[PDB]
Design a protein around this motif. Structure first.
Motif, PDB file in Angstrom:
ATOM      1  N   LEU A 136       0.841  -1.197   0.000  1.00 35.68           N
ATOM      2  CA  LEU A 136       0.000   0.000   0.000  1.00 35.68           C
ATOM      3  C   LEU A 136       0.876   1.247   0.000  1.00 35.68           C
ATOM      4  N   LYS A 137       2.047   1.124   0.619  1.00 33.73           N
ATOM      5  CA  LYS A 137       3.047   2.171   0.540  1.00 33.73           C
ATOM      6  C   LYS A 137       3.555   2.339  -0.902  1.00 33.73           C
ATOM      7  N   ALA A 149       2.112   1.555  -3.803  1.00 33.72           N
ATOM      8  CA  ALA A 149       1.093   1.952  -4.772  1.00 33.72           C
ATOM      9  C   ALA A 149       0.886   3.460  -4.770  1.00 33.72           C
ATOM     10  N   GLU A 150       0.360   3.990  -5.875  1.00 31.79           N
ATOM     11  CA  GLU A 150       0.014   5.411  -5.978  1.00 31.79           C
ATOM     12  C   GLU A 150      -1.111   5.802  -5.018  1.00 31.79           C
ATOM     13  N   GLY A 202      -2.777   3.967  -2.057  1.00 32.12           N
ATOM     14  CA  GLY A 202      -3.001   2.926  -1.068  1.00 32.12           C
ATOM     15  C   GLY A 202      -4.400   3.102  -0.525  1.00 32.12           C
ATOM     16  N   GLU A 262      -3.431   6.025   1.608  1.00 28.99           N
ATOM     17  CA  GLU A 262      -3.910   7.378   1.292  1.00 28.99           C
ATOM     18  C   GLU A 262      -5.395   7.573   1.549  1.00 28.99           C
TER      19      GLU A 262
HETATM   20  K   LIG Z   1       1.266   5.333  -1.183  1.00 32.98           K
END
Ligand SMILES: [K+]
Lengths: 970, 30
Positions: A689-690, A692-693, A695, A710
């Motif tokens: 998740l960190k 990914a664009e 999370g 996010e």
């Molecule tokens: K992120």
């Protein structure tokens, strides 16, 4: 308590006078809260101060001291010129400062959706209490478990787990999880890393479960000390706006000084340059936006507020800009695409085996909720489970291989899940089946919930449980017959593929029969039939080890050796489970196609079923070829790096993946410049998740997963994501709507004034008038555009690119095309009053230019009045046109490209309101007599208002020509 | 009655503030 680590659990408990088994009394909590304060950093406590903020600008102060050196020179309309300018600009401040503080408050208040929580044991309740960390006090007992964020500074009292792994990274740097213990760390000096009996506020629980006492809260905690010594990054769009901010600011500042120099020797007419300066600095105040426009943050605050009220809690703000550009969505299935409302609806057992021949006893179960209310049918006719000897044993396995129960909620009125969804659904089946013919018809709803289950439990003692492991994909329970000698047994449930191989026999009634290849294939026949069919059932095979190893021949804490203890099994049956796709998912999937966003389902289902569900929901077509577009984690791992990467370009479906596969998928997706939204919920998904664009964390999921993302789906719904991406795109449009209107109108103000100078015409607007339109437009119709409804076709175009410029070439042209005409239409209205109007006209040849030579040079080429140039009537045509054309231009900003005949002026019912309210203020400075002296005298009631309107209105038509070009080009 | 409510409260405050601005130029009269 300051030295808690060095002192014993007993010493700490004693210090706070708290019972470990009880927690604090509601009284202690109260007194402790008084004494120690809320577990938080203090709120650093605007209004009047924020108004004087705007006068710190040097260009605004230059104007005020140019309106003072104009007053003081006069004293030793222009009498109260510094009085009006100051009164407008203090109002202009409040209009755009109160808008700013409101937006920021609304964005700050988003935090209330996701409050920081904690789990305390207190004297008033036996059960664990989940209160806001905010209210946690030094002294009370806290509970932390896998996925928890440690709510305060805690001395560990007992680790309820076999191991407690803590992710201290946020505080120490140690990125590997630390092991923990209960013993006192005797050194009072010892640094945090050495404090191996301590849990630090702000840190995570990577695995296990601990109970402890809170030692310090608030600013007294370790991370609270950091956050006092703690004293930064611009989102791509901000950098492209600030860059354009200078671009626009430095063009207008050049034209501002060019207006002062074009008026060369005109400083003499009535030292004299101070007029042409304050009329060139008033443009620098009216056309240049210093500080981010207030309506920008107003429509972002309003956007995110809508999102939260749709269940999309925005954690990271810039993710709203990222949200427009998303091109891929990696959604998990069971929670998010499907309801997780599970129920066994089909089951089979062995019927008759004769060599290569194998037939089955299939059954269907009515009732699809968690309630023990349904029929077992065979051939659509109801049957009694108890008559079939296989069904008895099937039901026994489902009862014992179960960590769940049911619970009749009395006030809600419905039966409710206790354990896991899958297992409750097994409890419920054992209830409906009633294999032992228990009298249940007279039981109360509450006493009914587990009746049939608890009968089986009174038939064999559950000795221990071999817990589920991803490698074998199954769990089992060891059992000895209750009281009184049928030998001990194990009961296994798990994936069919896995356990069927580990079966050496099959149960037919009460008979055991050697497991053949024809029987093996027959079982899987139906297993496949079910997972591929209309309802894509998640099958489980239930088996028993008839002869289990000695109770002391098995390592009961080593996970890996478990499968060995689950062999020599006997196949008994299979339960086919139903967990249906959420209804909106079908359509939200379709939206994403239209949006241009790829959707990748990640599942726990076996490939076959995994593909079938993708066909069901529309990820795939019913016929579509899929062979190279869906992979299992195993297959995916046997591809070379480059083929793995290639696979990620086209794949829509990943079944049975490692936790480490999500980070890999993100990475590969990224090498193709995709903007990817990943869903997660466990401690395992944190790194992914960190990466990914966007999370996206599950609401029901672990704190850790949320803290690393996010955005959190409050309702765990996949459609919530799609809705969020729309609200993201809808916001970006609404920004550019207001941005167009602000930038074109300011270009209007620059074209208006630079025509007066560079042609030679008389003053089009006085500084008092220019600052008036610039207050009414920026105060009513501008702030009304932050309230216009989400644009029309936003979700039908492909996703915005993050490499695109904020304002394109074509759009810069629309800002000029309009910006020109608005500037020319105001200077072509004041000049109209002379040239072609019937109120003392200038020469239609071209004489109005040379207004400068009249008071002394009358006898040459004039022959008229030489004081009706400063007349109070051309300027009230220039102001009236400007207001009306600005109200007209505000209607052009209800949509970027969509015409008014498809999105009417009443789409924003509030902009029409601000038009009338602006018109009431404009008519008040034309009629209420103390004012029009300081401004100018009214426009001729009906004749000149028709001219104003026929001058202004075409600006709407002009944009419609530009919008038609625009719509009929894409 | 949610965003539409935070709408009147917005515009009406911006109108009220400009109204007073005039009735300070209208007050400053001698
Ligand atoms: K992120």
């Amino acid at each position: 308590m300051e030295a808690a680590h060095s002192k014993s659990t007993e010493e700490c408990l004693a210090y706070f006078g708290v019972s470990e088994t009880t927690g604090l009394t509601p009284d202690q909590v109260k007194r402790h809260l008084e004494k120690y304060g809320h577990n938080e950093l203090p709120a650093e406590e605007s209004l009047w101060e924020l108004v004087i903020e705007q006068f710190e600008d040097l260009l605004v102060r230059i104007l005020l001291l140019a309106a003072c050196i104009s007053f003081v020179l006069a004293w030793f309309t222009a009498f109260v010129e510094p009085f009006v300018i100051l009164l407008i600009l203090i109002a202009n401040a409040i209009v755009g400062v109160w808008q700013e503080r409101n937006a920021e408050n609304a964005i700050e208040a988003l935090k209330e959706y996701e409050p920081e929580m904690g789990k305390v044991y207190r004297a008033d309740r036996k059960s664990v209490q989940r209160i806001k960390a905010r209210d946690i006090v030094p002294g009370d007992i806290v509970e932390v478990a896998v996925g928890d964020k440690v709510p305060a500074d805690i001395r560990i009292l007992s680790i309820k787990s076999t191991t407690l792994r803590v992710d201290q990274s946020i505080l120490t740097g140690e990125s590997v999880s630390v092991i923990k213990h209960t013993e006192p760390v005797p050194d009072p000096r010892a640094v945090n890393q050495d404090k191996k009996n301590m849990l630090f506020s702000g840190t995570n629980i990577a695995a296990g479960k601990a109970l402890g006492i809170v030692a310090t809260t608030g600013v007294s905690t370790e991370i609270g000390k950091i956050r006092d010594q703690m004293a930064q990054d611009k989102t791509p769009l901000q950098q492209k706006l600030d860059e354009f901010g200078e671009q626009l600011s430095k063009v207008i500042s050049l034209i501002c000084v060019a207006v002062w120099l074009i008026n060369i020797g005109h400083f003499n007419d009535p030292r004299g340059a101070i007029y042409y300066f304050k009329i060139a600095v008033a443009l620098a105040v009216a056309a240049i936006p210093e500080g981010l426009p207030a309506v920008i943050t107003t429509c972002l605050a309003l956007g995110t507020r809508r999102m939260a009220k749709k269940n999309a809690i925005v954690r990271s703000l810039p993710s709203v800009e990222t949200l427009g550009c998303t091109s891929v969505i990696c959604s998990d299935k069971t929670g998010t695409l499907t309801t997780n409302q599970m129920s066994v609806c089909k089951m089979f057992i062995i019927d008759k085996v004769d060599g290569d021949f194998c037939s089955l006893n299939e059954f269907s179960i009515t009732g699809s909720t968690y309630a023990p209310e349904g029929e077992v049918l065979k051939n659509d006719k109801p049957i009694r489970s108890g008559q079939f000897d296989g069904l008895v044993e099937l039901a026994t396995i489902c009862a014992l291989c179960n960590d769940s129960s049911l619970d009749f909620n009395e006030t809600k009125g419905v039966y409710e899940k206790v354990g896991e969804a899958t297992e409750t659904a097994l409890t419920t089946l054992v209830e409906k089946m009633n294999v032992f013919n228990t009298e249940v018809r007279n039981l109360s709803k509450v006493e009914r919930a587990n009746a049939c289950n608890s009968v089986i439990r009174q038939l064999m003692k559950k000795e221990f449980t071999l817990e589920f492991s991803r490698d074998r994909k199954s769990m089992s329970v060891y059992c000895s017959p209750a009281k009184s000698a049928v030998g001990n047994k194990m009961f296994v449930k798990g994936a069919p593929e896995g356990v069927i191989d580990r079966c050496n026999y099959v149960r037919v009634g009460t008979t055991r029969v050697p497991m053949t290849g024809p029987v093996k294939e027959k079982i899987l026949s139906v297993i496949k039939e079910w997972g591929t069919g209309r309802d894509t059932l998640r099958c489980l095979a239930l088996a028993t080890r008839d002869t289990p190893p000695k109770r002391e021949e098995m390592v009961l804490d080593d996970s890996s050796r478990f499968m060995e203890y689950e062999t020599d099994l006997t196949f008994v049956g299979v339960v086919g489970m139903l967990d249906p796709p959420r209804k909106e998912v079908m359509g939200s999937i379709q939206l994403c196609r239209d949006a241009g966003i790829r959707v990748i389902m990640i599942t726990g289902d076996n490939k076959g079923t995994a593909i079938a569900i993708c066909r069901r929901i529309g990820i795939f077509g019913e016929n579509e070829e899929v062979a190279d577009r869906a992979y299992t984690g195993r297959e995916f791992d046997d591809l070379p790096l480059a083929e793995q990467r290639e696979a990620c370009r086209r794949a829509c479906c990943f079944a049975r993946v490692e936790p480490s596969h999500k980070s890999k998928i993100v990475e590969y997706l990224q090498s193709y410049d995709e903007i990817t939204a990943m869903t997660g919920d466990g401690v395992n998904d944190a790194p992914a998740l960190k990466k990914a664009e966007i999370g996206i964390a599950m609401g029901s999921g672990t704190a850790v997963a949320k803290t690393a993302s996010e955005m959190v789906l409050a309702d765990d719904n996949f459609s919530t994501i799609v809705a969020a991406v729309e609200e993201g795109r809808a916001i970006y449009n609404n920004m550019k709507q207001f941005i167009r209107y602000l930038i074109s109108s300011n270009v209007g103000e620059v074209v208006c004034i630079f025509l007066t100078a560079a042609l030679g015409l008389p003053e089009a607007l006085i500084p008092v008038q220019l600052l008036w339109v610039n207050l009414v437009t920026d105060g009513l119709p501008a702030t009304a555009l932050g309230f216009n409804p989400p644009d029309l076709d936003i979700m039908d175009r492909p996703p915005r690119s993050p490499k695109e410029p904020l304002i394109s070439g074509w759009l810069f042209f629309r800002y000029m095309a309009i910006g020109g005409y608005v500037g020319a239409a105001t200077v072509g209205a004041a000049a109209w009053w002379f040239m072609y109007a019937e109120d003392g006209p200038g020469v239609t040849y071209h004489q109005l230019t040379h207004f400068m030579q009249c008071t002394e040079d009358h006898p040459h080429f004039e022959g008229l009045d030489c004081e009706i140039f400063e007349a109070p009537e051309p300027m009230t045509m220039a102001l009236s046109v400007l207001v009306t054309i600005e109200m007209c231009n505000a209607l052009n900003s209800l949509s970027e490209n969509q015409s008014l005949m498809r999105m009417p002026p009443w789409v924003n019912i509030w902009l029409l309101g601000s038009i009338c309210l602006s018109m009431s203020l404009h008519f008040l400075i034309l009629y209420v007599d103390p004012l029009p002296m300081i401004f100018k005298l009214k426009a001729l009631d009906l004749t000149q208002w028709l001219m104003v309107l026929k001058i202004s209105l075409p600006v709407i038509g002009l944009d419609e020509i530009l919008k038609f070009i625009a719509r009929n080009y894409l | 009655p949610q965003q539409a409510r935070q709408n009147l409260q917005n515009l009406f405050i911006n109108f009220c503030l400009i109204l007073i601005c005039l009735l300070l130029i209208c007050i400053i009269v001698m």
